[PDB]
Scaffold this motif. Sequence first.
Motif, PDB file in Angstrom:
ATOM      1  N   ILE B   1      67.737  61.569  27.032  1.00  0.00           N
ATOM      2  CA  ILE B   1      68.609  61.543  26.029  1.00  0.00           C
ATOM      3  C   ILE B   1      67.847  62.340  24.716  1.00  0.00           C
ATOM      4  O   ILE B   1      67.744  62.186  23.670  1.00  0.00           O
ATOM      5  CB  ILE B   1      68.831  60.257  25.473  1.00  0.00           C
ATOM      6  N   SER B  26      73.253  62.962  29.471  1.00  0.00           N
ATOM      7  CA  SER B  26      74.583  62.561  28.615  1.00  0.00           C
ATOM      8  C   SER B  26      74.476  62.942  27.171  1.00  0.00           C
ATOM      9  O   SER B  26      73.280  63.012  26.584  1.00  0.00           O
ATOM     10  CB  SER B  26      75.087  60.914  28.924  1.00  0.00           C
ATOM     11  OG  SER B  26      73.990  60.197  28.073  1.00  0.00           O
ATOM     12  N   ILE B  27      75.618  63.233  26.941  1.00  0.00           N
ATOM     13  CA  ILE B  27      75.690  63.744  25.428  1.00  0.00           C
ATOM     14  C   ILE B  27      76.908  62.983  24.652  1.00  0.00           C
ATOM     15  O   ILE B  27      77.787  62.179  25.182  1.00  0.00           O
ATOM     16  CB  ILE B  27      76.066  65.223  25.438  1.00  0.00           C
ATOM     17  CG1 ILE B  27      77.499  65.334  26.299  1.00  0.00           C
ATOM     18  CG2 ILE B  27      74.991  66.101  25.840  1.00  0.00           C
ATOM     19  CD1 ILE B  27      78.609  65.646  25.205  1.00  0.00           C
ATOM     20  N   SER B  28      76.877  63.025  23.268  1.00  0.00           N
ATOM     21  CA  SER B  28      77.850  62.185  22.799  1.00  0.00           C
ATOM     22  C   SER B  28      78.640  63.240  21.678  1.00  0.00           C
ATOM     23  O   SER B  28      78.028  64.040  21.137  1.00  0.00           O
ATOM     24  CB  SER B  28      77.128  61.132  21.513  1.00  0.00           C
ATOM     25  OG  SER B  28      76.456  60.251  22.258  1.00  0.00           O
ATOM     26  N   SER B  29      80.073  63.022  21.896  1.00  0.00           N
ATOM     27  CA  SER B  29      80.872  64.192  21.323  1.00  0.00           C
ATOM     28  C   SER B  29      80.479  64.239  19.689  1.00  0.00           C
ATOM     29  O   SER B  29      81.218  65.319  19.340  1.00  0.00           O
ATOM     30  CB  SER B  29      82.402  63.517  21.637  1.00  0.00           C
ATOM     31  OG  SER B  29      82.450  63.882  22.977  1.00  0.00           O
ATOM     32  N   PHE B  91      72.755  56.966  21.399  1.00  0.00           N
ATOM     33  CA  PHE B  91      71.918  56.699  22.340  1.00  0.00           C
ATOM     34  C   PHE B  91      70.429  56.280  21.741  1.00  0.00           C
ATOM     35  O   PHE B  91      69.333  56.969  22.288  1.00  0.00           O
ATOM     36  CB  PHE B  91      71.652  58.067  23.085  1.00  0.00           C
ATOM     37  CG  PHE B  91      72.827  58.432  24.188  1.00  0.00           C
ATOM     38  CD1 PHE B  91      73.947  57.324  24.251  1.00  0.00           C
ATOM     39  CD2 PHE B  91      73.362  59.623  24.351  1.00  0.00           C
ATOM     40  CE1 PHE B  91      74.906  57.479  25.034  1.00  0.00           C
ATOM     41  CE2 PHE B  91      74.172  59.698  25.396  1.00  0.00           C
ATOM     42  CZ  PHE B  91      75.364  58.845  25.553  1.00  0.00           C
TER      43      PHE B  91
ATOM     44  N   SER C 307      65.952  55.895  29.919  1.00  0.00           N
ATOM     45  CA  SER C 307      67.388  55.671  30.218  1.00  0.00           C
ATOM     46  C   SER C 307      67.950  56.807  29.260  1.00  0.00           C
ATOM     47  O   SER C 307      67.405  57.203  28.488  1.00  0.00           O
ATOM     48  CB  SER C 307      67.724  54.170  30.168  1.00  0.00           C
ATOM     49  OG  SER C 307      67.469  53.756  28.715  1.00  0.00           O
ATOM     50  N   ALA C 308      69.283  57.047  29.227  1.00  0.00           N
ATOM     51  CA  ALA C 308      69.983  57.300  28.310  1.00  0.00           C
ATOM     52  C   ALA C 308      70.040  56.362  26.727  1.00  0.00           C
ATOM     53  O   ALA C 308      70.643  56.861  25.641  1.00  0.00           O
ATOM     54  CB  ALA C 308      71.573  57.658  28.649  1.00  0.00           C
ATOM     55  N   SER C 309      69.434  55.293  27.101  1.00  0.00           N
ATOM     56  CA  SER C 309      69.181  54.203  26.071  1.00  0.00           C
ATOM     57  C   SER C 309      70.650  53.876  25.488  1.00  0.00           C
ATOM     58  O   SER C 309      71.412  53.743  26.321  1.00  0.00           O
ATOM     59  CB  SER C 309      68.189  54.876  25.034  1.00  0.00           C
ATOM     60  OG  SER C 309      68.078  54.043  24.148  1.00  0.00           O
ATOM     61  N   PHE C 310      70.724  53.469  24.118  1.00  0.00           N
ATOM     62  CA  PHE C 310      71.545  52.524  23.607  1.00  0.00           C
ATOM     63  C   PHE C 310      72.247  53.195  22.396  1.00  0.00           C
ATOM     64  O   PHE C 310      71.319  53.674  21.357  1.00  0.00           O
ATOM     65  CB  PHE C 310      70.876  51.473  23.405  1.00  0.00           C
ATOM     66  CG  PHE C 310      70.473  50.773  24.737  1.00  0.00           C
ATOM     67  CD1 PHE C 310      70.890  50.814  25.767  1.00  0.00           C
ATOM     68  CD2 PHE C 310      69.208  50.045  24.399  1.00  0.00           C
ATOM     69  CE1 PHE C 310      70.510  50.358  26.902  1.00  0.00           C
ATOM     70  CE2 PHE C 310      68.616  49.549  25.672  1.00  0.00           C
ATOM     71  CZ  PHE C 310      69.228  49.549  26.664  1.00  0.00           C
ATOM     72  N   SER C 311      73.483  53.191  22.210  1.00  0.00           N
ATOM     73  CA  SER C 311      74.093  54.172  21.318  1.00  0.00           C
ATOM     74  C   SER C 311      73.684  53.699  19.831  1.00  0.00           C
ATOM     75  O   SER C 311      73.552  54.502  18.803  1.00  0.00           O
ATOM     76  CB  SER C 311      75.654  54.245  21.253  1.00  0.00           C
ATOM     77  OG  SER C 311      76.011  55.054  22.130  1.00  0.00           O
ATOM     78  N   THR C 312      73.233  52.491  19.695  1.00  0.00           N
ATOM     79  CA  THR C 312      72.231  52.238  18.538  1.00  0.00           C
ATOM     80  C   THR C 312      71.200  51.089  19.088  1.00  0.00           C
ATOM     81  O   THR C 312      71.392  50.704  20.192  1.00  0.00           O
ATOM     82  CB  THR C 312      72.868  51.344  17.361  1.00  0.00           C
ATOM     83  OG1 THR C 312      72.007  51.377  16.335  1.00  0.00           O
ATOM     84  CG2 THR C 312      73.258  49.868  17.720  1.00  0.00           C
ATOM     85  N   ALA C 371      74.425  48.872  20.682  1.00  0.00           N
ATOM     86  CA  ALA C 371      75.576  49.622  21.183  1.00  0.00           C
ATOM     87  C   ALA C 371      75.092  50.846  22.153  1.00  0.00           C
ATOM     88  O   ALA C 371      73.979  51.191  22.318  1.00  0.00           O
ATOM     89  CB  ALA C 371      76.397  50.322  19.983  1.00  0.00           C
ATOM     90  N   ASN C 373      77.613  53.774  24.569  1.00  0.00           N
ATOM     91  CA  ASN C 373      79.245  53.971  25.067  1.00  0.00           C
ATOM     92  C   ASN C 373      79.232  53.713  26.422  1.00  0.00           C
ATOM     93  O   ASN C 373      78.432  54.173  27.566  1.00  0.00           O
ATOM     94  CB  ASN C 373      79.476  55.643  24.766  1.00  0.00           C
ATOM     95  CG  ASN C 373      78.516  56.563  25.551  1.00  0.00           C
ATOM     96  OD1 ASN C 373      77.976  56.009  26.551  1.00  0.00           O
ATOM     97  ND2 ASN C 373      78.663  57.755  24.811  1.00  0.00           N
ATOM     98  N   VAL C 437      84.884  59.198  20.280  1.00  0.00           N
ATOM     99  CA  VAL C 437      83.816  58.668  19.971  1.00  0.00           C
ATOM    100  C   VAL C 437      84.388  57.246  19.079  1.00  0.00           C
ATOM    101  O   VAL C 437      83.731  56.204  18.954  1.00  0.00           O
ATOM    102  CB  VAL C 437      83.153  59.624  18.921  1.00  0.00           C
ATOM    103  CG1 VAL C 437      81.701  58.707  18.456  1.00  0.00           C
ATOM    104  CG2 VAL C 437      82.652  60.693  19.533  1.00  0.00           C
TER     105      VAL C 437
END
Lengths: 122, 107, 590
Positions: B1, B26-29, B91, C307-312, C371, C373, C437
């Motif tokens: 990330i 992974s990426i976030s839009s 992330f 990990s890709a961890s956590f959106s927050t 958070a 996704n 998003v």
Amino acid sequence: VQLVQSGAEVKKPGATVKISCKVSGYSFSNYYIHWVKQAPGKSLEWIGYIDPFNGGTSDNLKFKGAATLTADTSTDTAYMELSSLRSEDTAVYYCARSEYDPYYVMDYWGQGTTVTVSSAST
Amino acid sequence: IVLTQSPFQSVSPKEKVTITCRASQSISSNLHWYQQKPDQSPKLLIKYASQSISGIPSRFSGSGSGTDFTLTINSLEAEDFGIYFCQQTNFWPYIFGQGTKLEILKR
Amino acid sequence: PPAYTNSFTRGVYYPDKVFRSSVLHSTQDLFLPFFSNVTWFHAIHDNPVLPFNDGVYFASTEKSNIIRGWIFGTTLDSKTQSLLIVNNATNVVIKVCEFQFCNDPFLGVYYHKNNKSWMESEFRVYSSANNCTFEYVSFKNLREFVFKNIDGYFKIYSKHTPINLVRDLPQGFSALEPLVDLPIGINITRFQTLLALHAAYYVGYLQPRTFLLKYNENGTITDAVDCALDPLSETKCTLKSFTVEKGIYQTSNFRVQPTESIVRFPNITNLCPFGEVFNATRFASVYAWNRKRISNCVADYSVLYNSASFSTFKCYGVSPTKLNDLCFTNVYADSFVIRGDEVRQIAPGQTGKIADYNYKLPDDFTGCVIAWNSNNLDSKGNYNYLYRLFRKSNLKPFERDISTEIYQAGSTPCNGVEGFNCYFPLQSYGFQPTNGVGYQPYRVVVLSFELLHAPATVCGPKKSTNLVKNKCVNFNFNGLTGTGVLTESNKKFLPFQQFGRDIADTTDAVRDPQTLEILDITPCSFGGVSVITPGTNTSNQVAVLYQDVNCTEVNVFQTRAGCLIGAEHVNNSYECDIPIGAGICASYQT
Ligand SMILES: *[C@@H]1O[C@H](CO)[C@@H](O[C@@H]2O[C@H](CO)[C@@H](O)[C@H](O)[C@H]2NC(C)=O)[C@H](O)[C@H]1NC(C)=O
Ligand SMILES: *[C@@H]1O[C@H](CO)[C@@H](O)[C@H](O)[C@H]1NC(C)=O
Ligand SMILES: *[C@@H]1O[C@H](CO)[C@@H](O)[C@H](O)[C@H]1NC(C)=O
Ligand SMILES: *[C@@H]1O[C@H](CO)[C@@H](O)[C@H](O)[C@H]1NC(C)=O
Ligand SMILES: *[C@@H]1O[C@H](CO)[C@@H](O)[C@H](O)[C@H]1NC(C)=O
Ligand SMILES: *[C@@H]1O[C@H](CO)[C@@H](O)[C@H](O)[C@H]1NC(C)=O
Ligand SMILES: *[C@@H]1O[C@H](CO)[C@@H](O)[C@H](O)[C@H]1NC(C)=O
Ligand SMILES: *[C@@H]1O[C@H](CO)[C@@H](O)[C@H](O)[C@H]1NC(C)=O
Ligand SMILES: *[C@@H]1O[C@H](CO)[C@@H](O)[C@H](O)[C@H]1NC(C)=O
């Protein structure tokens, strides 16, 4: 629209720096504040987000200063206390206005706060 | 990330430059582009990677495809170039681009 | 550069006003130890600011009477008081007055006219006075002035003695009566002498030595012995005697100090499963959130680094490095899936759809909202995901609302069928695999805990140091503490047995909690310290004997008795003289 930071803080390593991000020009309670570090000549580095209504500290750990982001809702001023200072923490600490919800944008910031962490006194 | 930028890009006025933000896995839009002038607070150019905050030049565009997010400038001006950043979204903590100092030749 | 030199015996002073006679009298009092270094100065081509420390010795070799001044204090900022002392035309002139000081404060000398040196009124020591809390007024030679501050008392002592030596402090003993006491109350961390400018002087520093004085009939200290100087003088403090006659006196003890410490805690210290919270395959939806007990374990955040961890990541209560430094009590990591913007709506004091209806958290909740996704996974067409769009109150702290009951808008009862404004309050999120998003679901988790105050269930990982052997260390094992020499021992401990012990009921063997092995323990050293001496009448040479150690921890001869230092083994065997132990009889002669 306005984020004003406490001036440069020069400490010995291991000491503590706390830095004030003073909000004006907008609603403090409707915006989280991002706290952004730029090591001198180095990239932008984000220490955490805070919440105006709460304890909304998240901490990117990486460099660990036992940091806690405190926001003063009367004065709309988020503090960043950076302790356990190291000579590498020396940097310009930006605070960044964040949305109060998921869309993380920092449109407007503080002016940046250089901290020189060294055994070298000013 | 964690996301990847090219450290430097040198272009000429009116020529088109594209600076990439390359995130691992992974990426976030959403993504956020920043122009840092020397010794000055970076300023957000591109929001959700598709949008400019108001007042930002129409030559400042952004995008993403796959794991890459582009900072795309069309028709540069010698006033324009600066250090450029992209900010990861979600992330856990927003991992800002290593930065890209843009140079414009022809002076 | 400071030119040191050898204090010899100077710096003894009547510690009190008591009188005595012919009486060796121990005293424990800040002195200048014998044979210490003194930081020696000059006057040529020399008066830096020095630390006051606890006290200060001082002297000067004056044929010329030049060193007339003293300025003491801490800041020397003119704001606090500072002593000042000036000895001029036999009239001593003394002040605690406050004034601010020169780069080089001093007195002047205009060389050789009717007024020799003139420049009494030189008086550029300082700016000008401010506040005054006291006043008083009044190489051949030597002026020894001890200064020390205790309990509002700066204190002085003095001697004026004739000598002839140009170089250094004459070797000979005389001690220092008080002149003064000043009840000033300053604190003094520094001081500076002062001079008449157109001459040696010294500085010691006082230490909490214990000396053995010897008063004389008239009551004048005619000698002294430092206790700590060296063995022969550790004796004379034992006997209370200057004469120390033949034989082996036992002065003191010696306990080998520990290396550092060893903290050791059982490997793995079990674990806390945030994965089957975070990486659980099918999350319960936001509208019904998991509440998941985690206990007897250790803050596991080391899985959450990779990990890709956590959106927050937001965990309310305390610093995220107190995750792993601080234990918790009732630990419920709340496993649920929420729509994207709804991370706001999960937080104390939130007005919102999540908060006010399907997933509501307390204002007093200490813990997480996190958070990421799940559009990358939870998305399909999945309408099984659901939410409470409307409810008639906020959920109580950590309460859930399960109601499939009709949401009743009008007083017309719906009775389990649809009708005019007849609503089923719960509703679903259609997940469109093109979700963006704003439309992406966020699986979101919340750690319930009290903070402290109840037993450690999720604990912090507790730091277990490494292990050292054969070397005296402090230690703690598993909360068993003690201090010893941890060695390797065949003591076959039982599978469930933790300690060992011993007839005396004293911890002996232990087993390393992490890796299971039988460590001895062993006391540190002890031993007495005996000081063999031929009577001081014969020599001053003593041979210490460290009883009952192996000669390391200390021309050394390891004995059956102990570690003998300072005597010369002799194959020959003569009659016993100063019997030591185990057949070893020291004696003085060649
Ligand atoms: C001794 O004098 C000094 C004035 O220099 C005082 O020492 C300071 O005390 C503060 C405590 O509030 C410390 O943080 C400083 O580091 C000290 N300074 C130095 C140079 O050590 C002190 O107040 C005086 N002592 C007494 C008992 O009054
Ligand atoms: C005095 O200081 C010198 C260093 O200049 C040192 O060599 C010497 O051992 C010291 N003497 C004592 C008794 O500490
Ligand atoms: C010595 O100096 C003091 C400074 O206060 C001055 O008052 C005095 O006249 C001088 N001379 C004598 C002899 O004391
Ligand atoms: C004490 O002083 C007197 C002075 O003459 C002297 O006779 C006597 O011997 C002295 N005794 C001691 C112990 O100092
Ligand atoms: C602790 O870790 C080491 C790693 O090799 C292992 O050998 C040892 O058995 C472990 N002990 C426990 C109790 O987990
Ligand atoms: C979840 O699984 C991922 C595998 O991609 C791993 O990196 C991460 O540490 C795991 N975390 C939890 C909390 O299970
Ligand atoms: C020991 O020395 C003292 C003087 O310190 C002397 O009086 C005595 O005669 C000596 N002892 C012997 C046995 O000669
Ligand atoms: C003394 O210590 C040495 C280590 O220097 C050790 O090898 C020897 O066994 C010890 N012997 C005794 C009697 O303590
Ligand atoms: C005694 O003699 C032996 C030789 O047989 C020698 O090894 C030993 O060192 C001698 N003792 C001393 C104290 O020198």
